Amino acid sequence: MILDTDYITEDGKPVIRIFKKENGEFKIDYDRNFEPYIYALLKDDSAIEDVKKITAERHGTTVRVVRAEKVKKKFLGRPIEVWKLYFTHPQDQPAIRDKIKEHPAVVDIYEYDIPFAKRYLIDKGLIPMEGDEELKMLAFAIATLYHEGEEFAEGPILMISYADEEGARVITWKNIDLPYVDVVSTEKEMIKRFLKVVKEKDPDVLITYNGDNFDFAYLKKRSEKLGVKFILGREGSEPKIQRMGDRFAVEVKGRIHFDLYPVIRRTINLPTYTLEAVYEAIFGQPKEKVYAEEIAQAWETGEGLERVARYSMEDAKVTYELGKEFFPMEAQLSRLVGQSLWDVSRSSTGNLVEWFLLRKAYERNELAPNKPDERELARRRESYAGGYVKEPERGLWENIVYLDFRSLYPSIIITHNVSPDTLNREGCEEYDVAPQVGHKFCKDFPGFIPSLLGDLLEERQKVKKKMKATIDPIEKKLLDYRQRLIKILANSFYGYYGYAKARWYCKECAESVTAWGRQYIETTIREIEEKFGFKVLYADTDGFFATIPGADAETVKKKAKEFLDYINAKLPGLLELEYEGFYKRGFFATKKKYAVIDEEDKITTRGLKMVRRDWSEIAKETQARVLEAILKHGDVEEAVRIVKEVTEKLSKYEVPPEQLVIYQPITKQLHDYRARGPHVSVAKRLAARGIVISYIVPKGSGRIGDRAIPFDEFDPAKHKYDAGYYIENQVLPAVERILRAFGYRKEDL
Ligand SMILES: [Ca+2]
Ligand SMILES: [Ca+2]
Ligand SMILES: [Ca+2]
Ligand SMILES: [Ca+2]
């Protein structure tokens, strides 16, 4: 299979290198016959002789046009004739493209900013990560000596850890009594030892967590300081560093540097992206953090080195575990888009669609529009109206069905042929008009994007049915990832339409999709109300919650299935409404805030879940008790009494102080925490003396931080906690947000 492609220069000529892994053997294929090129639209074919003679200069070397050929391609639906201009080297393109554009007889130029190695994969029809070849993976992490007022990598690397199927090991230059620790004499020997491990293991994938902006940069400065040839590449090369905007990225030639940090940054949404928080959210298992101060203190005193070595080991271990969880999904995404895993894993949603479209455009002989210039880019700060959100009929409801459209936005694009090449196209005999915005779309021929989107949805169905018949559980997982990734890519076409940097950007297309979406969701709602007598409790963009308040659970289900048969016969094209699920009870607080419970007793909450550690146990316990009384018992007046009971126990000081302790970690220098937080205030009082902050809020005057004390110093016989604080700032805010819709103000409890 193909891992990646790049180019080297030989006698001023580009040579493509294709890195492959066939039958467990690494191979490099060379191609010296791929010519870089750009298109040029001319107003007169006679002008081609003037364009051929246009010259530029890179660094003394004269840039010339190698050869030209007239080709017929499609552009905005219409057939067009452009000149394919070939060059000697891909770096000739940025040097001469401006001189060719400025020529009077040149209307415009196209496909002039496509990286050579990526242009090769598309033009040759090559797809990376294709097949069932097994890649060998290796994760690694480093521990460093940090001091407050020092430059980057001024301190040495203390430990280098690595992990794979054989387990996790730590290389260090100090004696540590642990079975997984390998001891060397110096930092130089530790680095050299790590090089030998990578060379002997010969992994296809190197997995890091933030290796793009820390690990490789630290290793580089250290190898320069110690005189070590950091040959990580399979061709004997040192890691290549690139600039990605305001940040960096690192390639390792012959292998795939898989940095988990940008991948997880897009996949899940978390408050922080530390390795500890990420691992705990994905695997649900805790991971202890050992700070730079503790590491430095342990290394200088030689005391708790086992704790440091164990932290180092866990870093490599969890990085390998996370890499095993996210890499197969990103590998299938790379195969789908048609680009290397290195680029795909570092590209955002907008670029992924663009690369997919660029490959398809070449296959369909479709000339790709250019990126917007700075002037046009500033003009594309255009916003528009989004999805429809119904104001919910607040309160507790019984026997609720959730109905939603199968791929609403892609269905609209296909059905109404929404595309920049069909937008206001004159000369057609059939059009579809978008409500409110009024944009017209030609229906005479399939548009470029709707046509590809139709093939994607069709391809996904071919994968779904092959999964049912696939005996092999590993192959079923592979197909499952591809199927899921097609759904993700198909649902990204809409956002791409409103993406200002997009080649196929079209605000008219984007707002037409949302306008049609608002129409279909609203028409379906009034249809179920008027012709089936349902009450629509709440709706958001592509689905709604409905019920018959005076009907049986089986009666609601039956009527819902009958409604589905009815509207699906009336919906045009690919639009389709589906039965998502049935819920025994449901509480709808405000727009975007609600909670439902199924027949199994599983509760789904969207809004103020409050599963955080920076909130007292008393507040979290009461909230759970309230939700249970509402969703399991359907007793609203019981949920109220529970809050009244808790506030009465808090006011009479009958609640144990252990369920009032708040735990908060110090992650930065005390001078940098100028938020006057209670945990920081407690920490500053500790630092004021000679020598996770666990504190309780006591009864007194001043700010919360002025009252707060560590729980170790709290004594029920000498001190009194702030009953008012735990009622008004902890319990009531957490519960009021749920009971709010009933009209139960804070003073009602
Ligand atoms: Ca590449
Ligand atoms: Ca659905
Ligand atoms: Ca088709
Ligand atoms: Ca239909």
Numbering used by the authors: 1 to 691, 698 to 755
Sentences from the paper on this structure:
Archaeal DNA polymerases from the B-family (polB) have found essential applications in biotechnology. Variants of the archaeal polymerase from Thermococcus gorgonarius, TgoT, that can either generate HNA from DNA (TgoT_6G12) or DNA from HNA (TgoT_RT521) have been previously identified. In this study, six X-ray structures of DNA and HNA polymerases are reported: (i) three apo- structures of TgoT, TgoT_6G12, and TgoT_RT521-; (ii) two DNA-bound structures of TgoT_6G12 in binary and ternary complexes; and (iii) one DNA-bound structure of TgoT_6G12, which has incorporated two HNA nucleotides. Consistent with all other DNAPs from B-family, TgoT and its variants fold into five distinct structural subdomains.
TgoT_6G12 polymerase corresponds to TgoT variant with 14 supplementary mutations (V589A, E609K, I610M, K659Q, E664Q, Q665P, R668K, D669Q, K671H, K674R, T676R, A681S, L704P, and E730G). To better understand how the mutations added on TgoT variants impact the structure of the polymerase, the X-ray structures of the apo form of TgoT, replicative polymerase TgoT_6G12, and reverse transcriptase TgoT_RT521 were solved by crystallography. Crystals were obtained for the three polymerases and diffracted at 2.4, 3.1, and 2.35 Å, respectively. Comparison of TgoT_6G12 with TgoT_RT521 structures shows a strong similarity between the two polymerases (r.m.s. deviation for Cα atoms: 0.6 Å). The final apo TgoT_6G12 and TgoT_RT521 structures contained flexible segments in the thumb subdomains. The high flexibility of these segments probably results from the absence of DNA or HNA inside the active site. On the contrary, larger rigid-body movements in the palm domains (r.m.s. deviation for Cα atoms: 2.7 Å for TgoT_RT521 and 2.3 Å for TgoT_6G12) were observed. However, very large rigid-body movements can be locally seen between the thumb subdomain of TgoT and those of TgoT_6G12 and TgoT_RT521. For example, between amino acids 619 to 660, for TgoT_RT521, the r.m.s. deviation for Cα is 9.4 Å and between amino acids 619 and 650 for TgoT_6G12, it is 7.9 Å.
